[PDB]
Enzyme design. Structure first.
Site: not given
Ligand SMILES: O=C(CCc1c[nH]c2ccccc12)NS(=O)(=O)OC[C@H]1O[C@@H](n2cnc3c2ncn2ccnc32)[C@H](O)[C@@H]1O
Lengths: 115, 111
Positions: B29, B84, B91-92, B97-98
């Site tokens: 997004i 991450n 990392q969010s 997730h890649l």
């Protein structure tokens, strides 16, 4: 020669010296000689695959094994605050060695975008 | 649960590229390149540091799905894959997730 003749194949066969963190029958982890972070190491398969775009479906377990070894090595190196894993493909990725490998970088805040 | 769990459950919209029984690929997004998508497992692994050895095939599957999607999206000059971990990794979302980014020159260092 098993592993090929890229620099990483030579490292696999102990023909070029490297600072090796971890080694098993499937892969090798060693420190990057041009580190982009305080800790910067690589995990490479012993099987020669030139780049991720040509990996086969049955390379899945080996590729996942690189990431598992990467996170284990990161833990053993004390990267308790986190790290970034990177695979570069081709020209737009900046790939300079055509033996597939995983970068692991940590010991500083990593920024966004990732290049 | 995380926003990625909502995406897996189809509770919020996402631009889905590919789906099978164990993973999902969708456009980011907040893209950082002309092409920027994510590949996530449907199994909730919060971060790569807690993945188990039994997850190795699943994690490799994310990368193979990633490179297949990149080829399908026309990334014939290459791309960068990113995972991450934690605060220093940036990392969010705490669901593994890649990232796959391409369509421009990716630079060095990678953040
Ligand atoms: O090299 C890039 C991005 C860079 C890059 C340079 N310019 C750019 C512009 C845009 C994007 C990326 C870049 N892409 S890459 O995925 O192929 O990484 C290969 C890695 O292998 C490392 N290396 C090379 N010889 C050795 C080594 N490490 C340890 N050794 C021990 C003995 N001998 C070595 C090298 O320092 C690099 O980090």
């Amino acid at each position: 020669r098993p592993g090929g003749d890229t620099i990483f194949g030579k490292i696999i066969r102990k023909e070029i010296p490297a600072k090796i963190i971890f080694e098993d029958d499937r892969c090798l982890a060693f420190h990057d000689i041009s580190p982009q972070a305080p800790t910067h190491f690589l995990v490479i398969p012993k099987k020669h695959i030139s780049q991720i775009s040509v990996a086969e479906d049955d390379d899945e377990s080996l590729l996942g094994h690189l990431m598992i070894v990467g996170k284990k090595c990161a833990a053993d190196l004390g990267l308790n605050k986190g790290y970034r894993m990177v695979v570069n493909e081709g020209s737009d990725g900046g790939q300079s060695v055509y033996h597939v490998h995983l970068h692991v970088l940590g010991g500083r805040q990593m920024h966004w975008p990732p290049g």
